[PDB]
């Protein structure tokens, strides 16, 4: 069980690998600020109609 748990932490380590990939996504993230405001702007127009 203990050695299998050490093997299970290979999946946990793989989760941090996706987190480092996401780090590049944090530099790219400014596009999400314009994307999020845009969907609320047309949604506000749709609600006002």
């Amino acid at each position: 069980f203990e050695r299998m748990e050490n093997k299970v932490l290979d999946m946990e380590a793989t989760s941090q690998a996706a987190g480092e990939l996401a780090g590049f996504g944090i530099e790219n993230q400014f596009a999400q600020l314009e994307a999020s405001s845009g969907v609320e702007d047309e949604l506000a127009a749709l609600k006002a109609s």
């Binding site: 380590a13 989760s15 941090q16 690998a17 480092e20 990939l21 780090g23």
Partner: protein, 110 residues
């Protein structure tokens, strides 16, 4: 030593003779391609440090939920009148909160 200095001179002449057979226009952009794979090597290693940082944060969440488990065992021991087992459970809780503070310190550096 004298033969080290003479050796580096003859080796430098041979290295310069090879260096001028390389076309400066073609090899200078090969040097930029090589520098781009150097950045490819750095990004793989940097990402692996992020995984290691998250692994110390996993140990911290395991030992903190293990301390909550032992606190519940201490509560159970006190309702069952077994105060001697409640102290034992509190001693396990203390070693888990003290190692959690070591992992918090490790995580802050990471």
């Amino acid at each position: 030593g004298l033969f080290d200095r003479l050796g580096r001179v003859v080796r430098a002449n041979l290295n310069d003779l090879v260096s001028k057979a390389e076309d400066p226009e073609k090899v200078l952009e090969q040097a930029v391609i090589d520098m781009q794979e150097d950045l490819v090597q750095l990004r793989q290693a940097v990402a692996r440090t992020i995984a290691e940082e998250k692994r110390t944060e996993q140990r911290l969440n395991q030992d903190t939920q293990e301390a909550k488990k032992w606190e519940d065992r201490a509560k159970l021991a006190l309702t069952n009148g077994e105060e001697n087992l409640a102290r034992e459970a509190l001693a396990r809780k203390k070693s888990l909160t003290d190692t959690a503070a070591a992992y918090q310190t490790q995580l802050a550096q990471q």
